[model samples]
Target: IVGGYTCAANSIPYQVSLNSGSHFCGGSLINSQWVVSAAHCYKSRIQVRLGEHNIDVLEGNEQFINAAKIITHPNFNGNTLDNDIMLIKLSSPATLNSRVATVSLPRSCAAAGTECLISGWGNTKSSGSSYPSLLQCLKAPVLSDSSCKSSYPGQITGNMICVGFLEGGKDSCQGDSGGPVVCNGQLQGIVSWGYGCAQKNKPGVYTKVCNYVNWIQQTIAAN
Candidate 1:
């Protein structure tokens, strides 16, 4: 997380780490066997680690599971980052404990100006390369869809949302793709893309989770 400090321990129980073979990305446990993440996370195989606070340390609460399936949105656009959300089916159901749980999805959309947060094991610097051993978090404010649209004219569709400081200095950097964008303890977005990390007037963009609720339910039901 760029311009963020070490995250509070075990605060976001639904957060998970996606091991995409050589690298890792962040994800959220939406249910006992379903994980929601960014479709931009390229990988042939996916292994998820839940209840993890630090990457180097092994917590007893941690549960590592292999992916049974990965469902990327058909309309997802990698270049433009439209509908950048995806779902992962776990091989086995997650055994919920105090340290492991599902995140509550928003029944409605988050309003602009609400204080949101993003947690990740991404780079600490926007232009440099450094990965944190522990999770990092930063408070991100939801930007108005109009303002966000102004930033990326003809690009910021309804399927996407924006969050960050207008002056820059804070963001989810590289390796944060697929992480959670939470508001009032509810899952709001999935970290999707940006115009470089924390650039001036450039807030982090995310896959608007609320817009896909019906589709997600139908996909889950169909499978």
Candidate 2:
């Protein structure tokens, strides 16, 4: 397992629900006011669980944040799964506390080959669905742009980054989309996709956070 952290008061976790009660993946809190996730993860009206884990019953200190707006990448192509990114504006800003705090976006980024961390509630096993009880995380090394492009030969683009164990067995699976890929304690990527979960020679791909820096800034400014 990678180093996992808890959410703060103003920090909220996003979940992708398949049915009325089933969840598949996890997302992060951005700015205590917005959630950045995968556009493909928005299969339905996604439920953003703010304070607690249990969806069946709200015991205490749990908040269900509704989305005031859902914005997918303007160039998102669901058919090709290109530009698979989205953002959700929370109906309101959450109050911050120990368990909930906004993660910092990367300011100055390092070149490829840097180490980073990714966290999610994705499935532990390669064949199952996402885990619902506890969150999971893992550390992966960033692949250089040249290597990433050469590895896939065509799929990887300027908007994406590759990070995972080269030997495989540990990686983000089907349910890990939109989770954070943190490097140097700042968010640099969001879990995207790969050939298969935890497969040998296949690494997890993520949306390059740096490429979208301008988009994020502009969106926040407009909103």
Candidate 3:
């Protein structure tokens, strides 16, 4: 995350790292056996790591497990990056504790200008591959659908929401995809894509999580 600081230990208990030997994306543990992330982060042989604060260190609180299955959105559009959401069934249920927990799904859509918290282990800059060892956190306001549409020009959809400053700075970057965008203690959005990290007029775009409540519940119910 750009223009962010190291998150305090145990502050984000639901935060998780999606890995295939290394941290590739961030995700949120929504339930004991389910994790939500971006569809673009999909890959076979994924390992879900929970309770992770610093990726490079052996935090001891971490829970490393394999992904039993990954279900991506059926209508996901790769070209426009719409419907960029997915769920991962963990091989085993995560043991909840002070360092690992689940985040609640949103009951309503987060309105424009609502302040939200975004946390991840993504890049800290727009240039270079400077990913942080510790998890980072930043606060940004939800932008209106029209504002998001204007920023991307025909790329914004109802399934997407934009957050960040139009003046630039404070945005989610590479390796942050699929992370949680928390608003009012609920899972409001999922870090999906953006033009450039912390670029002016190009706010960070996310998958609107409130639009998929039924899909999530049904997917878990049937599977």
Candidate 4:
């Protein structure tokens, strides 16, 4: 994360590291067996680590599990990057502990200018260099669709959100996609795609969780 520093190990327990035998993307535990991430980060044989802070050590609170199922959005548009969300079902339920938990999903859209948190182990800059071993976090202001549209032109969609600074400072970079962007202790967004990290008029784009709450319930119920 650009312009961000290290975070406490168990600060965000819902956060997960989606690994493909290597660090791939980030995700959030919506419940004991379900995780929310980005469809663009789809992988077979994906492993999810809960209660993890550092990548190398096996923290006692860590709940490492295999992915039982992966569900990508049906209407996902690979070209325009629409409906980039995904759901992963763990092979087993997570063992609830202080360092492993779930987040409440929002019922409504996040208002513009809301200061939300985004954390990850991604690169520290837009140039995309090495990233920290420990989790990094930063706060970013959500921009209204009208304001965000200016940066993305016709690219921003109803199911997406734009967050960052007009002057460019903090953002989730290459290694952080599919992570949670939370506000007021509620899950608001999921890191999807972006033009770059913290670029002027090029805020990071995310999948709006509020837009998929119903879909999430139905999908989970059926699956």
Best by TM-score: 3
Each candidate's TM vs. the true structure? 0.96, 0.84, 0.98, 0.97
Q: Output candidate 2 Cα RMSD.
A: 3.6
The Cα error of candidate 4 at residue 221, in Å, is 0.8
Where is model 4 poorest over a 10-residue stretch in terms of lDDT? 124-133
User: What tens-digit string does per-residue lDDT give for candidate 1 at 1-223?
Assistant: 8999887788888889998553488999988999999998957699998888887788677898999989999998878888898899899999888788998888889999989889999888878789988899999889999889887778898888999887888999888899999998889989898888988888889899988888777887887
After superposition, the stretches of candidate 2 with alpha carbons farther than 4 Å from their true spots are 1-20, 52-61, 128-132
Please list the Cα RMSD from the true structure of every candidate, rounded to 1 decimal place: 1.2, 3.6, 0.8, 1.0
Ranking, lDDT, top scorer first: 3, 4, 1, 2
Q: List the pairs of residues colliding in candidate 1.
A: none
lDDT of 2 by residue, 1-223 (tens): 2223432322333322222256555566777788778877875466666555444455575556767777888988776667878887778886666555667777866577888867766666766544545556576789877766766778887778888766778787766687788888777878888887877777788888877777877887788
- Lowest-sum lDDT 10-residue window in model 3: 125-134
Candidate 1: how many backbone clashes? 0
Which residue pairs collide in model 2, if any?
2-137, 7-99, 7-100, 8-99, 8-100, 8-101, 9-100, 10-95, 10-96
| CA lDDT scores, all candidates in order | 0.87, 0.68, 0.93, 0.88
For model 4, residues 1-223, the per-residue Cα lDDT tens digits are 8988788888988999998888889999998899999999999779998898998787677888999999999999999889999999999999878889999999678889999999887889667498678999888878889888888889998999987777777788887999999998888989888777887777889999999999888988997
Clashes of each: 0, 9, 0, 0
How does candidate 2 fare on TM-score?
0.84
Model 2: weakest 10-residue lDDT segment is: 9-18
